[PDB]
Amino acid sequence: FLWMLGQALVDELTRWLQEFTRHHGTMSDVLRAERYLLTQELLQGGEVHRGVLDQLASELLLDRRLRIPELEEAELFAEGQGRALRLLRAVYQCVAAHSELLCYFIIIL
Amino acid sequence: LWDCLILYNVTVIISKNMLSAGIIWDSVCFFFLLLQRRVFLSHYYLH
Amino acid sequence: ELVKGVYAKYWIYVCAGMFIVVSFAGRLVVYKIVYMFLFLLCLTLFQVYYSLWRKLLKAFWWLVVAYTMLVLIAVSELFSSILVPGFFLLACILQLHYFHRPFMQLTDMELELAAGFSDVLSRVQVFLRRLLELHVFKLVALYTVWVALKEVSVMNLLLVVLWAFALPYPRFRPMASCLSTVWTCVIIVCKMLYQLKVVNPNWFGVRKGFPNLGYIQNHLQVLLLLVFEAIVYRRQEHYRRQHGTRQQLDQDLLGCLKYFINFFFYKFGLEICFLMAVNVIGQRMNFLVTLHGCWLVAILTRRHRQAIARLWPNYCLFLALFLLYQYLLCLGSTNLISDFLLLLCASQQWQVFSAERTYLDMLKVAVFR
C-alpha cells in the first residue's frame, strides 16, 4: 500500500540522516549523554554534579560508568516512536551537526 | 532582566493607552514574558 | 413507571409555562406578577432560607389558594378568561389535591459503556455547575450584559450595588443573588405598566418602558438564569446530602491535565489578572483606563507575590468602585463588561491569594528549557 511504502521510506530517511550526524551523535554520547538531561522531576537535585557529569578518544568506552541510572531512559520514548517523531529527531540532529552549512544556505537564500 | 523587559512591555501598552498599530501583539508578548518570568523556578528550571 | 413520580414532581415548571401564557394576557400588570413572578418569588423564598430548598410548602400551598380565588372571582372574553386561567388553575388545584410532596415535600434537604460515559459526563459538568465556575461567573456575565450593555440607569441595583461588592467579598455572594431575583422581579412588575399613561414630560435617566415585548424581553432572561443556577445547585446539594495536587503532575499527560483543570486560577490567576488589565486597556484606550494601567504598574512593581497580596484588597476595592462610577457616568457599555471581567478575575484571585494558598517529560522539556 502507498501508506506502507511511505513508512518504510521514512525509516530509510532516518537511517540516512543518522549516517550524516553519526560523528556528532557519538560526540554527544561522550559528552551530552552526561550533559543535557531535563528529566529529573519533583523538587531540586540532591547530588547536583553526580547526577549529571558523572552519570550512566572519539569513541570512548565505559571509562566513566555503565548504564546505572538507565542509559535507555532517553532511548525509551525515543525508540518508542521510531516512526514520525524519530524522523524529526533525526532532522534536528542533522541541522545541529551541520549548523554552519545551514547558516550558509539561509544567507544565499 | 526579565522583569525589566516586562516593564518595557507594560510601558508600551500604557503609553498606547494615552494615544492622543495596536496592543494586540504587545499583549501576546506580555503573556509570554509573564510565562517565562514565572517558569524561572528554583526547582524545574533549577534542573 | 418512573414517569408517574416524575410528573408528580413536574408541576413547578408546568405552571411556569402556563404563567407564561398568563403573561401578556389578562392583566398586563397584576397577572404577570401574581402568577409568574410570585411563583418566582416563592422560588426565592425557599432559596433564601438556605435550608428549605424545595421544602417551603406553606406559601407554596397558598399560592394555589390565591390563584383559585382569582379564578373564582373572575377568570369570547368571559369565555376567554375562564378557559385560559382554568387551564392553569386546573394544574394548580391538582397539586393541592394530590402529589404536592414530590416537588415541595420530597425533594428536600433535611445501558452499556457509551451510556455509562454519558451519565458520568452529566455529573462532572454538574459538579462544575455546583462549583464557583457556574455558581457565580456565568450568572454575573449575563447580568452585566443585560444591565450595563442593555437597559441602563435604574438597573444599577441589579449590578453595581450588588455584584460590584459581592464579587470581591463572597460572604454575601448568595444573598446578593437572592436579592437580585427579588429586584428584577420588581423591575418587571414596574415596567409592566409601560410608561405611556398620560406622559407629562423624577429623573434617574428615565428611558421609559415604551416597547411591550422587546422591553420585557431581557430582565426575565436573567431571572430565569438565577433560577437555573439555583436548580443545579440544590440538585447537587441534595445529591451530597443524600445519594492530583502535584502528585498527578509528574505522572503523565493525563496527570498534568487533571492538575491544571482543577488548579489553574489557583496559581495562574495573578498572571491572568495582569493580562485582563491589559485587555481592558486595549478595549477602551480612554483616560479612565489610565487608572487601571496605573494600578497595573503598582502591582507589577510589587514583584514578590507576598507584597502583591497586601495590595490586593485595595486593588479589588478600586475595581469595584470603578464599576460603580462607570455606571453612574453612563447613567447620571462594553467597557463596563471589561472592568467586570477584571473585577471577577481579581476577586477570585483575592479569594485564592490569602486563602487557598495560605513522554510528558518532552512537554516539560519545551516549557522548561
Q: Which terms summarize this structure?
A:
4 helices, 3 chains, mainly alpha, Piezo-type mechanosensitive ion channel component 1, 109 residues, Complex of human PIEZO1-E756del and MDFIC, membrane protein, part of a larger assembly
Describe the structure in brief.
The structure is cut from a larger assembly and holds three copies of chain A. With 109 residues, chain A is an all-alpha fold. In chain A, 51% of the residues lie in helices and 0% in strands.
Describe the structure.
Chain C: It is found in: Endoplasmic reticulum membrane; Endoplasmic reticulum-Golgi intermediate compartment membrane; Cell membrane; Cell projection, Lamellipodium membrane. Chain C: It comes from Homo sapiens. Chain C: Belongs to the PIEZO (TC 1.A.75) family. Chain C: This is Piezo-type mechanosensitive ion channel component 1. This is part of a larger assembly, with three copies of chain A. With 109 residues, chain A is mainly alpha-helical. Chain A is built from four helices and no strands. Chain A is globular and about 50 Å long. Chains B and C meet through α1 and α2 of B and α14 and α15 of C.
